Protein backbone atom coordinates (compact mmCIF):
# COMPACT_ATOMS: atom_id res chain seq x y z
CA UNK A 1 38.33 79.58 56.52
CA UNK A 2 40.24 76.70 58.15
CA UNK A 3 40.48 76.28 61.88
CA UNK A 4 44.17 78.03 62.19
CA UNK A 5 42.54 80.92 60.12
CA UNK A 6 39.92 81.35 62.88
CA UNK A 7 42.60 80.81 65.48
CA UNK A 8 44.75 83.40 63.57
CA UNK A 9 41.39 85.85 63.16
CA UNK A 10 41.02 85.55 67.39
CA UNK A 11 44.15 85.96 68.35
CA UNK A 12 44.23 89.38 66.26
CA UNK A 13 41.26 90.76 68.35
CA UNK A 14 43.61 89.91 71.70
CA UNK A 15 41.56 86.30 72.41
CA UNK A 16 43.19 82.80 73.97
CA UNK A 17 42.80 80.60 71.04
CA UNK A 18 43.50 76.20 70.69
CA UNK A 19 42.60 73.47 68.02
CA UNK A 20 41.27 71.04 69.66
CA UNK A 21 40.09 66.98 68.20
CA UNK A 22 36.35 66.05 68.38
CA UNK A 23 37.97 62.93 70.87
CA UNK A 24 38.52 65.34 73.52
CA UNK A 25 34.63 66.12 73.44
CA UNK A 26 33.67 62.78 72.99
CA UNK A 27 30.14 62.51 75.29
CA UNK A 28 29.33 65.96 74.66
CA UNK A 29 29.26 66.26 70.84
CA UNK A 30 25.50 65.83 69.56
CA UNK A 31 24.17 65.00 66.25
CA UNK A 32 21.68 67.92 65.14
CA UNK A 33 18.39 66.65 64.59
CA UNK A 34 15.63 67.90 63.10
CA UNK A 35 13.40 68.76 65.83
CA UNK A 36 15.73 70.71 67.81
CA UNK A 37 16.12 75.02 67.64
CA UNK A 38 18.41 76.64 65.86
CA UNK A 39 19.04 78.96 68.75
CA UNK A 40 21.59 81.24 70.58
CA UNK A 41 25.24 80.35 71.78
CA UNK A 42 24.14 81.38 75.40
CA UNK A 43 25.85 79.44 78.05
CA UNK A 44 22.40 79.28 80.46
CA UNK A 45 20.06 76.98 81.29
CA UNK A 46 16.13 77.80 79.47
CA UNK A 47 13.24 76.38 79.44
CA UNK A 48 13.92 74.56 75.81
CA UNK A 49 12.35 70.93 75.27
CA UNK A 50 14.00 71.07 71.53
CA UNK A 51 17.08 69.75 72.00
CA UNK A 52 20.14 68.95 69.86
CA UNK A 53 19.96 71.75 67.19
CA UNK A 54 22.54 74.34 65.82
CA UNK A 55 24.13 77.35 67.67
CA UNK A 56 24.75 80.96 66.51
CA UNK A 57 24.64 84.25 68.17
CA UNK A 58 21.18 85.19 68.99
CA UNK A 59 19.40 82.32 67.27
CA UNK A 60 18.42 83.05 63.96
CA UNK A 61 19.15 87.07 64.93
CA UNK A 62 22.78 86.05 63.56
CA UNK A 63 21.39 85.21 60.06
CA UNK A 64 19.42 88.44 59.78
CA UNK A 65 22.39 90.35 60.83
CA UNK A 66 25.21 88.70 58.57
CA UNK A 67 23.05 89.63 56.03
CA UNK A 68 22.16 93.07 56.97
CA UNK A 69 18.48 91.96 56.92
CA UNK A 70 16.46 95.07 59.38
CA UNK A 71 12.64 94.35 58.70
CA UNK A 72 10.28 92.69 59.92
CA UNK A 73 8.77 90.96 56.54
CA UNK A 74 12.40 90.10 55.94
CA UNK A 75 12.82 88.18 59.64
CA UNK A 76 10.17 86.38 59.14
CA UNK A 77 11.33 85.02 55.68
CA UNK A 78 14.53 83.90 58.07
CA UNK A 79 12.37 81.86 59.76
CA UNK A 80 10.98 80.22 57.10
CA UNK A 81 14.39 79.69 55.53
CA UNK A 82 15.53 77.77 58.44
CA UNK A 83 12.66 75.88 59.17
CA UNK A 84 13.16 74.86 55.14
CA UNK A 85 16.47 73.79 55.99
CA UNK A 86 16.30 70.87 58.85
CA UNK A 87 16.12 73.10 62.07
CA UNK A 88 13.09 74.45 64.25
CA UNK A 89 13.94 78.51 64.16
CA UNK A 90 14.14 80.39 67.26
CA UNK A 91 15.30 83.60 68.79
CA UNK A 92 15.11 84.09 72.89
CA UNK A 93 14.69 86.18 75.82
CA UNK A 94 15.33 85.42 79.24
CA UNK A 95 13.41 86.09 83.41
CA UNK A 96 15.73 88.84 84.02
CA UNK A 97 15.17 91.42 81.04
CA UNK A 98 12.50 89.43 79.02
CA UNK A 99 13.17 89.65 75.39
CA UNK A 100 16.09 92.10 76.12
CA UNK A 101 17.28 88.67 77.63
CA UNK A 102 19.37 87.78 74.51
CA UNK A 103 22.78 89.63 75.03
CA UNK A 104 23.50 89.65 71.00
CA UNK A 105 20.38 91.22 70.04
CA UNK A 106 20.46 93.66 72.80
CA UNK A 107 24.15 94.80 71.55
CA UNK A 108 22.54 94.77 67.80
CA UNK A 109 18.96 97.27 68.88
CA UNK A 110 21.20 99.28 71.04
CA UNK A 111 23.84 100.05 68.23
CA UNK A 112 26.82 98.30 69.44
CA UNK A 113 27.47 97.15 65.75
CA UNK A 114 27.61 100.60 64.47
CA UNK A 115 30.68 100.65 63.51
CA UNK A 116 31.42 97.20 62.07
CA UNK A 117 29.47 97.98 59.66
CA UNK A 118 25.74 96.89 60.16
CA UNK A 119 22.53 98.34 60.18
CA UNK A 120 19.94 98.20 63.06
CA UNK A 121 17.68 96.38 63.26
CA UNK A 122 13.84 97.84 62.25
CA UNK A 123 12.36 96.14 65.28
CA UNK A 124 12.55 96.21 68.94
CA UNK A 125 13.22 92.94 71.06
CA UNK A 126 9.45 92.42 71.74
CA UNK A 127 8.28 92.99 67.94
CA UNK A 128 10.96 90.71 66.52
CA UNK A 129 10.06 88.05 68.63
CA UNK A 130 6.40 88.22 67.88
CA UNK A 131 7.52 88.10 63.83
CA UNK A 132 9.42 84.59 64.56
CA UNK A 133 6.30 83.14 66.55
CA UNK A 134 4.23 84.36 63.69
CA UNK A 135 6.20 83.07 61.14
CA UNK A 136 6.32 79.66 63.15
CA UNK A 137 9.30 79.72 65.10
CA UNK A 138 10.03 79.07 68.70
CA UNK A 139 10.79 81.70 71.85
CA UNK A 140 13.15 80.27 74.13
CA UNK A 141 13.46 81.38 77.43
CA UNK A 142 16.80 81.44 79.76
CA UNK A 143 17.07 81.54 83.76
CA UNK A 144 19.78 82.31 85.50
CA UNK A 145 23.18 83.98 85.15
CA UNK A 146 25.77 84.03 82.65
CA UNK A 147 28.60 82.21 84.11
CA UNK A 148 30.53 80.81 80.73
CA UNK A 149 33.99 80.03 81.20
CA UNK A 150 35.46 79.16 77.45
CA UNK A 151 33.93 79.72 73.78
CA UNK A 152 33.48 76.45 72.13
CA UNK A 153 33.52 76.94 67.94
CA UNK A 154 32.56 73.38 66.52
CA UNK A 155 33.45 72.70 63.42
CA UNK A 156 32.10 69.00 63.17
CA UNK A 157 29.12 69.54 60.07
CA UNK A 158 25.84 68.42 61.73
CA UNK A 159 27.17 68.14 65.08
CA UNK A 160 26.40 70.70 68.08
CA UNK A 161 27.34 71.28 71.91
CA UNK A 162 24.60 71.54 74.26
CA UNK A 163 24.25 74.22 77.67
CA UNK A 164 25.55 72.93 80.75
CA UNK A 165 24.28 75.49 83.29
CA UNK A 166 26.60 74.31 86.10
CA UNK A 167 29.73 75.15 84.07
CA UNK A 168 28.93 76.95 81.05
CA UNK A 169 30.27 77.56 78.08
CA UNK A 170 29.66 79.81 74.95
CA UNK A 171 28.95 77.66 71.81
CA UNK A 172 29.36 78.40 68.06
CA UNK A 173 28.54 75.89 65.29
CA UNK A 174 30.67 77.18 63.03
CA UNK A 175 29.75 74.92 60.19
CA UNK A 176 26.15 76.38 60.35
CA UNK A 177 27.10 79.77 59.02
CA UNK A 178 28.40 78.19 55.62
CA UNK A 179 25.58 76.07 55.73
CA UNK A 180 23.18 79.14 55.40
CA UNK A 181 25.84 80.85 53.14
CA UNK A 182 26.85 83.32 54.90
CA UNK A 183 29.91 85.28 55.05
CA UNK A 184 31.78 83.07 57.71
CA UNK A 185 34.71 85.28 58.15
CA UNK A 186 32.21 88.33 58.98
CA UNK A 187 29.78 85.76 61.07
CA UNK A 188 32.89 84.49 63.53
CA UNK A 189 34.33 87.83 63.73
CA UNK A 190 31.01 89.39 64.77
CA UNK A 191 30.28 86.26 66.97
CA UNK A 192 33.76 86.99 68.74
CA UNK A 193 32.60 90.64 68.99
CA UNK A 194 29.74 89.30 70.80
CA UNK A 195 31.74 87.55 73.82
CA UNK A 196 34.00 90.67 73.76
CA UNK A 197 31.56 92.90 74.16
CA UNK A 198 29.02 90.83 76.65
CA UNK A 199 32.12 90.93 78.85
CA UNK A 200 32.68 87.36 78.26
CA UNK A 201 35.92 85.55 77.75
CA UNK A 202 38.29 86.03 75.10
CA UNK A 203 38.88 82.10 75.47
CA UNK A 204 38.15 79.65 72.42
CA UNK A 205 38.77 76.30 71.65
CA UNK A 206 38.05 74.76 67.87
CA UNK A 207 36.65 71.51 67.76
CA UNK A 208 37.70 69.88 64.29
CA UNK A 209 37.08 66.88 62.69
């Protein structure tokens, strides 16, 4: 899907949409490394020392879901995926709800994705969490309110956006999804689903190369 098609996709669902260069982010773009979490698009600030790794709605919770994965035996295979594939994995909470903290997963265990098609997860926020530390991922914790003003969706391939919790933003590494073969279309859509549904904004700008 090219970066007009994702503009296209928003705009369908009622969203702001702009292409955008990778100059006009220039000392905020990020090269992943390995270290760093694979972890949620959340705008807040957290207690993460694991810096500079990929973005997608609820941390790993967005691979799980893409692929309609419910148990527990099959998050924790997730985990192991990613941590296979150059990234630390992680999945979060937050000191306001605890694990009920991450906004995606909360809209997944509470059935908001009904009718798009997916099934619920087989776990509750606390359980799943357990699963990733288990399996040898990493909880993140948030603090804080949600005050994100725009949707960032980078396209740059190894590249990432980090939180700034004095003006935040929502951030989407795009690029990740095909890089864990997943169906992108289906992963952005849900992803703008997300925002709509947190209450967030309808807002995005595409970072290309």
């Amino acid at each position: 899907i090219s970066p007009a098609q994702i503009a296209e996709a928003l705009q369908g669902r009622g969203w702001d949409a702009e292409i955008v260069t990778d100059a006009s982010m220039a000392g905020q773009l990020v090269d992943v490394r390995p270290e760093g979490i694979l972890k949620c698009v959340d705008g807040r600030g957290s207690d993460n020392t694991r810096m500079g790794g990929p973005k997608m709605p609820g941390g790993i919770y967005a691979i799980a879901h893409n692929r309609g994965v419910t148990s527990i035996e099959g998050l924790k295979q997730i985990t192991k995926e990613v941590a296979s594939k150059g990234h630390l994995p992680s999945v979060h909470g937050d000191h306001s709800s605890d694990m009920l903290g991450c906004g995606f997963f909360k809209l997944w265990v509470t059935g908001r994705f009904d009718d798009m098609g997916y099934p619920r997860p087989q776990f509750d926020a606390d359980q799943g969490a357990n699963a990733v530390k288990d399996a040898g991922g990493i909880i993140e914790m948030h603090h804080g309110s949600h005050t994100e003003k725009v949707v960032y969706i980078n396209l740059l391939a190894n590249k990432t956006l980090e939180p700034n919790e004095n003006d935040q933003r929502f951030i989407v590494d795009g690029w990740a999804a095909d890089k864990f073969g997943l169906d992108v279309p289906k992963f952005l859509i849900a992803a703008a689903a997300t925002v709509e549904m947190l209450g967030g904004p309808k807002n995005a700008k595409i970072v290309v190369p």
